[PDB]
């Protein structure tokens, strides 16, 4: 069987600046009949895929000359000359070869001035207390780029692994993201502490800082 | 409009199964091959089946061989992927797609390369295979709320805000899937402190799979 191998896994690119993703192959890809059997898709966000390149090198109907798409046997490329934000998604490279098998994917996102984000914390709320459970969230708005590390604390003292953590996707306007970390307790253990708090730390903080509350 | 519907989907339990068809109009069918393709939620894309005009050289993966059949009515413009028995890794969403053929020789005995070429694709349907059902109850410069959205089965929920009034500032999460393997999500909304009191909000929470739609009043301290 083949294996279908890409890089990078995510490209942050800068529109009107190029960028270029690679794809490879466990075995050579032409024949039978001359030339490669490799698409590329792109799967804009929210998106079914659609074709970009195929038969390694063919522009499908209706694609910017911005992409070029080069190689032949095992590596591959898919260079955009002048990206444009419309072109975020994830490039596929795919193969034609024996029967059909998908590249692993390349993440592309606009590259952004970093920024930092607000924070937020959530108690509780005595309906979900009622039924007998305390989720507390915490808030990361609007920061760039995406690698966060948010912590909570109760009564000072760390946690580990009781903590789930969603980020929306890149905003399409202002390209930042944004992050909740909840963490799940039994009422029972809530109702015995009284400090709740988490502890963002983004590179665009000169420190941490922490958000609050008591009960 | 040139264009591809899949359906079927839903929920069902493992070793469960489902027909999913996929219809097509604006085109001529018989002169395309066509594909299933699968995107498990978070996961990449995954070729699933292929299939000729002719109605020949079913193609399969090996995640799904022996349990999925590709079938085809070029007079009916249609596409069908009978699943059986249904696994829990055959969660996903499924893509029919149009796509070129060029054929054999040296392929087995007589191959095709069904889909170098692939340009067009339905939305998608989505199925969903896991045990048991039903609903999740919600419970609730600049200072944010939202609503927490929990305990709920399956996939999707359409949380809103004031209807439709609140599209500014919204950061609706993506469900993360809880241990227990109902999932949930926070709905938030960045608003400016002034609002409060004057300005109140409500999130309007749909869960279709359950019959149930809400939205709460966040109101802080009293
Ligand atoms: C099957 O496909 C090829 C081109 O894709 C065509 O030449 C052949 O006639 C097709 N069979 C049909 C349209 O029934
Ligand atoms: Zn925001």
């Known amino acids: 069987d083949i294996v279908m191998t890409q890089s990078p896994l995510s490209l942050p690119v800068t529109p009107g600046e190029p960028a270029s993703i690679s794809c490879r192959s466990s075995?050579?890809?032409?024949?039978?009949?001359?030339?490669?059997?490799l698409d590329w898709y792109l799967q804009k966000p929210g998106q079914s895929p659609q074709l970009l390149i195929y038969l390694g090198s063919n522009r499908a109907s209706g694609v910017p000359d911005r992409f070029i798409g080069s190689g032949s046997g095992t590596d591959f490329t898919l260079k955009i000359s002048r990206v444009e934000a419309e072109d975020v998604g994830v490039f596929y490279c795919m193969q034609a070869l024996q029967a059909v098998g998908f590249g692993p994917g390349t993440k592309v996102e606009i590259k952004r001035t970093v920024a930092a984000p607000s924070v937020f914390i959530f108690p509780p709320s005595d309906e979900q207390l009622k039924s007998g459970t305390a989720s507390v969230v915490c808030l990361l708005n609007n920061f760039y780029p995406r690698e966060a590390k948010v912590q909570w604390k109760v009564d000072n003292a760390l946690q580990s692994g009781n903590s789930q953590e969603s980020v929306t996707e890149q905003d399409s306007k202002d390209s930042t993201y944004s992050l909740s970390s909840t963490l799940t307790l039994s009422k029972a253990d809530y109702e015995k502490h009284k400090v709740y708090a988490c502890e963002v730390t983004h590179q665009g903080l000169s420190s941490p800082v922490t958000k609050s509350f008591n009960r | 409009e040139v264009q591809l519907v899949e359906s079927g989907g839903g929920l069902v339990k493992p070793g469960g199964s489902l027909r999913l068809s996929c219809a097509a109009s604006?085109?001529?069918?018989?002169?395309?091959?066509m594909n299933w393709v699968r995107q498990a939620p978070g996961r990449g894309l995954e070729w699933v089946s292929s299939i000729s005009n002719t109605s020949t050289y079913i193609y399969y993966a090996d995640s799904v061989e022996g349990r999925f059949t590709l079938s085809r009515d070029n007079a009916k413009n249609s596409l069908y992927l009978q699943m059986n028995s249904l696994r829990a890794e055959d969660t996903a969403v499924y893509y029919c797609?149009?796509?070129?053929?060029?054929?054999?020789?040296?392929?087995?005995?007589?191959?095709?390369?069904?889909?170098?070429?692939?340009?067009?694709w339905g939305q998608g349907t989505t199925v969903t295979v896991s045990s048991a059902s039903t609903k999740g109850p919600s419970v609730f410069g600049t200072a944010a709320l939202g609503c927490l959205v929990k305990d709920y089965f399956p996939e999707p929920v359409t949380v809103s805000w004031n209807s439709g009034a609140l599209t500014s500032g919204v950061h609706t999460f993506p469900a993360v899937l809880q241990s227990s393997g109902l999932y949930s999500l926070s709905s938030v909304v960045t608003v400016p402190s002034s609002s409060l009191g004057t300005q109140t909000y409500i999130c309007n929470v749909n869960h279709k799979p359950s019959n149930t739609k809400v939205d709460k009043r966040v109101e802080p301290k009293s």
């Open positions: 075995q050579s890809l032409l024949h039978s009949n001359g030339y490669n059997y």
């Open positions: 797609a149009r796509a070129n053929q060029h054929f054999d020789w040296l392929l087995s005995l007589l191959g095709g390369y069904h889909y170098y070429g692939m340009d067009v």
């Open positions: 604006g085109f001529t069918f018989s002169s395309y091959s």
